[PDB]
Amino acid sequence: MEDFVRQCFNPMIVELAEKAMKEYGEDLKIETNKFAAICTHLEVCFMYSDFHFINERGESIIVESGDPNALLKHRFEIIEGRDRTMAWTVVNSICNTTGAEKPKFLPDLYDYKENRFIEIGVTRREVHIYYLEKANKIKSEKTHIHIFSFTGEEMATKADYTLDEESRARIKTRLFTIRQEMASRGLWDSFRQSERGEETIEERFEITGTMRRLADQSLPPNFSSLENFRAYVDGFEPNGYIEGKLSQMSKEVNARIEPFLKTTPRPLRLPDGPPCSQRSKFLLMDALKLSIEDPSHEGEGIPLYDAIKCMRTFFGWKEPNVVKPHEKGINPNYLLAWKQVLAELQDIENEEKIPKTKNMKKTSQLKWALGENMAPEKVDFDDCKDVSDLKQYDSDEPELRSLASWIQSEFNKACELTDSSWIELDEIGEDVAPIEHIASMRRNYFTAEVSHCRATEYIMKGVYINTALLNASCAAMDDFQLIPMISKCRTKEGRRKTNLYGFIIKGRSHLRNDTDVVNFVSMEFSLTDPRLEPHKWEKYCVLEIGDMLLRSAIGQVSRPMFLYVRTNGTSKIKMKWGMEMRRCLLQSLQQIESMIEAESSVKEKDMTKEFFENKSETWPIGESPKGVEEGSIGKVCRTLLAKSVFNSLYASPQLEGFSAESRKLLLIVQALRDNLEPGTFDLGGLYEAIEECLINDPWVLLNASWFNSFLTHALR
Amino acid sequence: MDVNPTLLFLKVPAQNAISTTFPYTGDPPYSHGTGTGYTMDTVNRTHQYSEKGRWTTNTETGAPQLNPIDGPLPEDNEPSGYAQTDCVLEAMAFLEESHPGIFENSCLETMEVVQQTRVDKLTQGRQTYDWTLNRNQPAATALANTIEVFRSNGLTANESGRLIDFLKDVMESMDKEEMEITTHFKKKQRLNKRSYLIRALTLNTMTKDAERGKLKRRAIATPGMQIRGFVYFVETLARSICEKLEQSGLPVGGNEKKAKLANVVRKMMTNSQDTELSFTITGDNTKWNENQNPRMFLAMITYITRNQPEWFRNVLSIAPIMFSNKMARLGKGYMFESKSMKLRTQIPAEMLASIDLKYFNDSTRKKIEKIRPLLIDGTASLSPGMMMGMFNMLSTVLGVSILNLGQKRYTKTTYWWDGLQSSDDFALIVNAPNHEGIQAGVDRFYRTCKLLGINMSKKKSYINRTGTFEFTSFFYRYGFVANFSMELPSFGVSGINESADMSIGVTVIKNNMINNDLGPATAQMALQLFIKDYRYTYRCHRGDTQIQTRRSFEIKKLWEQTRSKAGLLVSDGGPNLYNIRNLHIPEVCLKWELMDEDYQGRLCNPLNPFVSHKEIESVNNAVMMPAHGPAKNMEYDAVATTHSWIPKRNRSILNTSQRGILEDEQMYQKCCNLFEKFFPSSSYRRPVGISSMVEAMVSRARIDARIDFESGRIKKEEFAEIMKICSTIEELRRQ
Amino acid sequence: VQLQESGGGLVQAGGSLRLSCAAYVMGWFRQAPGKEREFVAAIDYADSVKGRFTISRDNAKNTVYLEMSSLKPEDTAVYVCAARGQGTQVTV
Amino acid sequence: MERIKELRDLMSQSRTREILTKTTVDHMAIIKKYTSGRQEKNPALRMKWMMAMKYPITADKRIMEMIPERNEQGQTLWSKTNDAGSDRVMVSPLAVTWWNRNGPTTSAVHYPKIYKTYFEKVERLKHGTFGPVHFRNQVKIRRRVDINPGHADLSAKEAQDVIMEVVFPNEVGARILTSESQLTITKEKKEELQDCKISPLMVAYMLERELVRKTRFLPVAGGTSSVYIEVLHLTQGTCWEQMYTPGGE
RNA sequence: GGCCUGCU
RNA sequence: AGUAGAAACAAGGCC
């Protein structure tokens, strides 16, 4: 039958009908009479629509061939011959522009004169039944319907026929051409009734070929095919198989509970080796401040001018000389770098306006100090294979180092009060609710407690230094840059003040990965002689740069004044995390506020004021040789803030591992102290897990010592 | 006196101050170089936990595979992957018996979803291993490349737009003699059957960064695109199953997890009378993923899909069949340094099979020597067990089956147990009349776990009396206690854009106040610090200050120009009006009545060249990877302002041989923008159909010109011009 | 579509002949004994036959006609109808 | 006119012509998401790192013809170098602030009508009345509650057709909404937003947010009302309760 | 010396 | 040298 559509109809219509065939997903080889019927429907749609044009009037202009002009409007514009999505697109667009009603089924054409749709259907059966059939299929329709049938008859409601009658003679001539051409073909044994509305399909997902063999190799050891295994599974029913293997399984497979008593836990062993060194990016306990007493705010001002003005406030400069060498570098380079920094600072002082940011010369001194041109050149393996020295990067456990007493004192003095306010908080919306007033009062109390704390000063120092370093690295990637360490505080009298700890020289910072390292050299003034705790300054070079006179009742001290100079490095991640050190304030004060709220849930009243003023209640916050010492809530605030600050400063994988594996043991010990009969399956394994995190970090070793002290004081 | 914060625990219980034990204020550990060492170590460890299995050689991939299932029962407490098929089938049968109709229903909804799912659902995924280029690429890019290759090779069933048809094409590709791929350096290369099989069965290995809570780094894996559809269907089934199990806690959030934990502890302890003792085990499973054999997941799913259409069973079984034969790419490689000659070199991992061992240290030398037998075409066969939690939900199903297997109806003894399982972590409440009963119950639970290939970490687990325990960093002590140290890293600028960062910060403060019991004063301090960091990050200072920045001049002139300066946004250098009462209001709407009409109009102008919206999914959704958890998405309330710009892209593609991808990106985006202008609903609802672009665009041009004349700007001259231009593009597409 | 031509034969030079084809667009082609197909007329006319020959059709008889006048010896050919017919011999 | 003209210009060049011809409508989404840009793992780090560069943001090409290349002192506002995989150009953040002080102005009166949810929140809070804070232990129990206070009792898919018919009336397709509540919602949001020119996508997104019901599990103590849950952070705490009555009541 | 890139 | 820690940075590539 398909030979007929090969022969007669034009290409355009046959591929339109083929795409309509693909539309609903049925195959053309099984039933083709539908293809012919609907392609004839589509053909009558065209032949009825084309050759029919309109101009600004009604009364369509009919031309056998559209002449070249702007007057190519089509009388009837076709609906079908398009995908369902576009057919409904045209339906909705016509409804929204023509203000007509939206039909629920697919029309075939639209006309302007009568401003409505045409649903053309030419069926094998006579018209006077198919018409009202499709009419009762369509609900309350104003779209006019018109149908032909092979006998040659026409019909329509309203007795309406919308265009010329010679066109309809055309239609029925086409119709009988179709008819008495099948006459030569002979199809009416099924042509009248060949489609009955079949819609059914079964989804087929068959495993075959290579993928089947893979299925045959992904079974238990004693199975040969997926078919057999699935049959076995379907036939499988529970018949007490877990019990049999449990009985047969060796009894050494057990989870015996070892009781956890007061005498069970042993102190954590600390590693032994050379004392632990300093790792901070700046001096914390041995910092010195040169000040100007200016009225500018933290960010307000220009760095270089402030630094120069602060440094001019000090008199007593001496020619620098080596006091304590780096022990691994070239100290003369550090000396020359310091003198170069001074010289270029003067050079800025001379000229017209202090630059906002200064670049330094790339001398051999800072070329060595900043580690320039030291990365091995990257080459290909095929060119370097016979080199005996060629091997992997050194990948082994870090060097072992024992704890020293300097970190303990540094933390002790990091929780001490100061003679300045190191936090100038921002603005918030004016409090409107009583709860907001309570929150503001609490916040004011904590700010009064923690602002005068060395932890806040360290927070500001780190934030400013890391912000400046990151910005300089991102801006001046190539050229070495000078950045004075600046921090602005407010005195007890209320006068604002600036403080200059020293200088940082940032080097080449072409940082691609988050782990890539930018090297800088840090110089900081101090008065602490490095000849008393040399092991804490393994990586520092310390010079003697001047003498300071601070008013004291013992005449006047006239102390020496040294310069701690070192080469340090950071990374994008480290800079970003060090510039978010202000969340240590959060951590600490959230803990304290949780304490206050928990206690106030007992007594139905806010308990902040008496906690902060009466200072009756105290918490164990340290141990003295006499015994455990307790301090007021403010001291707890400062201690927790210092702990968070040191966590942010000495952060490392060792800290995370020890924290987790020691929180586990802390929970076990707490369960013991709560009389909850705690038990363990392998306590030695937990101890070994904790002890492997303690390698060389001073902070984690101090935490381990604190944990041992807590165990000793606990378990009683 | 020496200060010691830990001594604070002598007065404050450990859980009431547990936040102090979370050093989440410093930089988390990161990996620096290759992850090849970790990948090799994981492969060797997975293969040696199942050493007593039986060896075979796949006839298709030619790789050695180790099957430990039904192997000898363990005789020691060391990790073992010798799961027994009959035991696990019985466990699943008991799970079904205790929850009748679970499998049949879940299979019904899964069948509905599979037969109505679309291909585009695969684009909604993070990095995936594209085999066309042998590298990780965004899910959409890899899917597009694979579809292009399939269409070039003759597999065009995916044009039906159905994920099931895409999988049919994927499987049909397995039986092809020779496929063709494209490489740029364009060159057409031919892949034989075995090479393509291994490229479709392989995984890409990387090192996990920003992982807090352990000293050593780990390795993670990413699968290809051929196997992700089957994984999607299997995980849909597993999620539908677990949603019907109250003992599971994987498909829920954190608060639901806490609620279920509280309910189970109350149920276990309350029902226990005075005579029965109760004990809670806070258990962690050692080597959870390395001991879960994909064959056992195949067994579980084929038991689940019993009495179901065979096509459903086949499509759900394809995934574990491929995992059982999965291969893993070793990784980036190894970098060597020579200090004598002062140079460095980078050898790819694919050379580990043949490269001499003189360059490697003892540990790496031994690892390579042990893993070499499993090396096939630069990748190692990893049949014995899963790599990194790809089947999280099925593992949770197995754990829930174990938990339910002790409902006192199967124990047949006075002791019994229950609890909650979330993959790699569990809380087990066991009750028994005497300590001997508790010991026997825990021993039998451990033994049954060892029969299913699941191991309990004795070093990271402990048992106490009920009332105090831990679960996924949630510490329960007669009621869950807030931590607030897990969410600390999320208190900074997110890094999306100005308005997005502001809204996300305020919303995070609000949420942590609601859930994590953040205090009022602490919340105010957090708001102040966040505002300070926000102003210092975006160079948007109050405007009345003299802080010179790269943006302080325009901000200051805008400040001096504005009359009601209280309406200026913090992004434009205005005062901050936020407070505890205003944390749930966008900044634009909070300052709407205070803005000057000129500034208000300039700010919220639709014609601004900065705002760009791509799809309904990416309107106000921000992907923030939370600390100590999987990547998560958040809805943030924000008004589309001129500050909603999107930041610069990487721009490093220009120096790579894969430079033509940018031209293809530009052309695809131009075509997509044209289509959207032709089809405005393209973004909100993704268009569907089987036609091609130009057909729809030209035909809609026809119709829209028509109707927009029937009322609108068009004129006959223009309408006819459009009609004949449509004809022109038609004849152009002809040729 | 089958086609049957009628109306060919032997004719005088300067004579007239009416071809008809009983059986869409139609035409007439011719084939002389020493050549392939030559276009005649269709329903347009070739230069060798224009003004002499007229093509017409009846769509109610289903017949295309070629009215040939002032015939030349050069018109001697088998005239085929096409929509191909078998052709009718015209000899002038 | 224009649209078909850039269509023809695209089809003029062979590569785009092939892309338009061979690519089917269904693959629309795929190729639209086809990109070499990886999703950032650490957005904060790079946002703090990119903002220190010049020209850190991106904007459409049109910015080159609305904003001058430099400001009064000569600080550059935009660059002509396009982004990696787009025709957009990289520009400095000042071009934002500049746009807010001398850029074109419009009538933003209809934004309150569009962003109905946020402005309703603001109005509800502005007329709220606070009360005394009572300090007592709060038994926070976890419950499933609806957060959206303006949901019109419609699901995502249920209101998606409404949203399309309100914004994209022609792409609705087969669906014609039956429920009369949807009829009235369509009428109201059609006549209200008849000429709003913000964007079809944002209008659709905000209509989805407003009408679609959404639910989440939260620890609550008292309240349980939609209006009382949006301020759950302000009314309920660990040991304090703040009586509050939104402006709606 | 000149120019390109900074998660590809 | 320095940062850092089971492998890396201490710029890369292209002419």
Residue numbers in the entry:
A (entry chain A): 1 to 716
B (entry chain B): 1 to 185, 207 to 756
C (entry chain F): 2 to 24, 34 to 53, 61 to 100, 118 to 126
D (entry chain C): 1 to 249
Give me lines lifted from the publication on this model.
Central to the replication cycle of influenza viruses is the viral RNA-dependent RNA polymerase which transcribes and replicates the viral RNA genome. The influenza virus RNA-dependent RNA polymerase is a heterotrimeric multifunctional machine composed of polymerase basic 1 (PB1), polymerase basic 2 (PB2) and polymerase acidic (PA) subunits, that catalyzes both primer-independent replication (vRNA to complementary RNA (cRNA) and cRNA to vRNA synthesis) and primer-dependent transcription (vRNA to mRNA synthesis) in the nucleus of infected cells. These structures have revealed that the polymerase is a highly flexible macromolecule that can assume a variety of distinct conformations, enabling the polymerase to perform both transcription and replication that require different initiation and termination mechanisms.
The most populous binding site, termed site 1, is on the PA endonuclease with five nanobodies (Nb8198, Nb8199, Nb8200, Nb8203, Nb8209) that bind at an interface formed by the short helix α1 (residues 1–10) and the long helix α6 (170–185).
